[PDB]
C-alpha cells in the first residue's frame, strides 16, 4: 500500500512472544568490524581474520557472514563513510588529541543524516533549526565564515576580502559546522580539497556501535551545551591487548548486535528514504 501510514498498528495485548530473534539475524544478516591499523598490526598474524571467523561460528554467524574493514586513521575513516554491512560495529582506539575528530565521526555514524549539495561560489547560506548542520569532509577542510545582516552585508567582515572572515575549521578531515541559526553566511571553503554539504539530522542509527577503547569516557556528542545523549549504540571496553578486545567483541556479538538492529531505511519501508 506503501507509504500511507496506517494510523495504527493494533494495540491489542495478545501477548504472544515470537521467540528468539537472534535466530533470524544469524541466518540473514552480515556483520562488519571496523578497526584501526594499529589494532591489526599488534595482532601480527596472517590468519587472525580467519581464526576469529571460526570463533564467530560459535556465536552463530555462518562462515561467509562476517567482514573485516581496516580504517588506518579516525580522519580517513571519517571521510568516505561507506558502511558495507547490515551491522557495523566500529572499534575506536582513544587518542586524546583527536577527541573532536572522533566526536564528529561518531555523530555521523551513530546518526541518520540527510544532505544536499552547497555551492559556496554563487549563494550564501543559513541553518534553520537545531538539526540543520553543515557537514564537510575531505583531504584538508578549511572553512572561513562571514555572517550577513539583512542586506547581504558583512557583520565584522567584508563579503569582498576573505581575510576578514572568521575561521571555524583549520584543515580537518571531517567537520560538522554550526552557526547561529537563522542568519545568512558567505562561506569560504577550500573546495579544492574539501566538499561541504548542507545536512538535516534525525534518525539515529540502528546499526553502529561505536565501541570505545580507552580513557575514561563520557562522550558529549551534542552541538549544544544543554543536552547530553547516551545511547545503547555507544559502548566502551577496557584496553588490555587487542587480541582481548576482539575476543570480547566475539564472545558478546549478539549482545552488541542486540543493542543495534534494523535501520529504518534498510527495510521494505522505503517509499521514504
Amino acid at each position: 500500500q506503501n507509504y500511507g501510514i496506517n494510523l495504527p498498528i493494533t494495540g491489542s495485548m495478545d501477548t504472544a512472544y515470537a521467540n528468539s530473534t537472534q535466530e533470524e539475524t544469524f541466518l540473514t544478516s552480515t556483520l562488519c568490524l571496523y578497526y584501526p591499523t594499529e589494532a591489526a598490526t599488534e595482532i601480527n598474524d596472517n590468519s587472525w581474520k580467519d581464526t576469529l571467523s571460526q570463533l564467530f561460528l560459535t556465536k552463530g554467524w555462518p562462515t561467509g557472514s562476517v567482514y573485516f574493514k581496516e580504517y588506518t586513521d579516525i580522519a580517513s575513516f571519517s571521510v568516505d563513510p561507506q558502511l558495507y554491512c547490515d551491522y557495523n560495529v566500529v572499534l575506536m582506539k582513544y587518542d586524546a588529541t583527536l577527541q573532536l575528530d572522533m566526536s564528529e565521526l561518531a555523530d555521523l555514524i551513530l546518526n541518520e543524516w540527510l544532505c544536499n549539495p552547497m555551492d559556496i561560489t554563487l549563494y550564501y547560506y543559513q541553518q534553520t533549526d537545531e538539526a540543520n548542520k553543515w557537514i564537510s569532509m575531505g583531504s584538508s577542510c578549511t572553512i572561513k565564515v562571514c555572517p550577513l545582516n539583512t542586506q547581504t552585508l558583512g557583520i565584522g567582515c567584508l563579503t569582498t576580502d576573505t581575510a576578514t572572515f572568521e575561521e571555524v575549521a583549520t584543515a580537518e578531515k571531517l567537520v560538522i559546522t554550526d552557526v547561529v541559526d537563522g542568519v545568512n553566511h558567505k562561506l569560504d571553503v577550500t573546495t579544492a580539497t574539501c566538499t561541504i554539504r548542507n545536512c538535516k539530522k534525525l534518525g539515529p542509527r540502528e546499526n553502529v556501535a561505536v565501541i570505545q577503547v580507552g580513557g575514561s569516557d563520557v562522550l558529549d556528542i551534542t552541538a549544544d551545551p544543554t543536552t547530553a545523549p547516551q545511547t545503547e549504540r555507544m559502548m566502551r571496553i577496557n584496553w588490555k591487548k587487542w587480541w582481548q578486545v576482539f575476543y570480547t567483541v566475539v564472545d558478546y556479538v549478539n549482545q552488541i548486535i542486540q543493542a543495534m538492529s534494523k535501520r529504518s531505511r534498510s527495510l521494505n519501508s522505503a517509499a521514504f528514504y
Binding site: 498498528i9 493494533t10 491489542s12 495485548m13 501477548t15
Partner: protein, 132 residues
C-alpha cells in the same frame, strides 16, 4: 422490579432497570501507536483499559510535542457501548494511574518489546462527549 419489567415489555412499552457500577464495557486492554519506529524510542499514541463501568486512557508523546504545531499533541479515545445507557452518574478524573508507571510492552506485531517510562502532565483541553 424484574417481573414488573417483564410485563411492560410484553405490552411493548418503555421498560428500564437500575444498576450500580454497570458492566457495559467488554474487557479491552490495548494501545495504538500513531508514530513508531523499529527501536520504539520515539513513540506517540494511546493505551487504555475499558472494563465493566470504567475507562482509563493515556496519551503519550516521547518527544513532548517538541516539533508539534503549537507544541500540542492531540489525543482521542472513543468507546461505543453495545446498549444505550440513560441517567448515568459519572466520575471523571484527570490522569490514568494504570498507565503512569514504567512498563515493558509487546510490540504491535509481537516480535519485540518496547519501554514506556511515563512522566505525567495535566491533560489539556479535556472534552468529554456523550453521543447518541
Amino acid at each position: 422490579e424484574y417481573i414488573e419489567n417483564w410485563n411492560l415489555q410484553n405490552r411493548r412499552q418503555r421498560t428500564g432497570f437500575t444498576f450500580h457500577k454497570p458492566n457495559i464495557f467488554p474487557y479491552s486492554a490495548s494501545f495504538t501507536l500513531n508514530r513508531s519506529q523499529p527501536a520504539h524510542d520515539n513513540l506517540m499514541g494511546t493505551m487504555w483499559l475499558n472494563a465493566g463501568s470504567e475507562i482509563q486512557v493515556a496519551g503519550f508523546d516521547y518527544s513532548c510535542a517538541i516539533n508539534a504545531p503549537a507544541n500540542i499533541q492531540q489525543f482521542e479515545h472513543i468507546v461505543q457501548l453495545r446498549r444505550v445507557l440513560t441517567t448515568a452518574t459519572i466520575t471523571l478524573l484527570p490522569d490514568a494511574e494504570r498507565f503512569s508507571f514504567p512498563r515493558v510492552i509487546n510490540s504491535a506485531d509481537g516480535a519485540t518489546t518496547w519501554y514506556f517510562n511515563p512522566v505525567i502532565l495535566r491533560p489539556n483541553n479535556v472534552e468529554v462527549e456523550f453521543l447518541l
